[PDB]
Design brief:
chitopentaose, monomeric, mainly alpha, about 60 residues, about 0% strand, Chitin binding beak protein 3, 1 helix, about 15% helix, sugar binding protein
Length: about 60
Amino acid sequence: QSMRTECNTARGKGHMLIAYPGDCSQYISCDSNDQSPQQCASGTVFNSEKQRCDFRANVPSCKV
């Protein structure tokens, strides 16, 4: 809850190119509140709590 050892949070400007597109932003906000703060959408991985496990070939989790 309370961590005073995050003085190294200034090291996220090297491989943060994951935020290139925009769909990732519209999915991170449309997936977090959609079911829960478990949204993992980042291009083709909607590991959101909404049960959208499609991190592979964008396969929809249409569990019968």
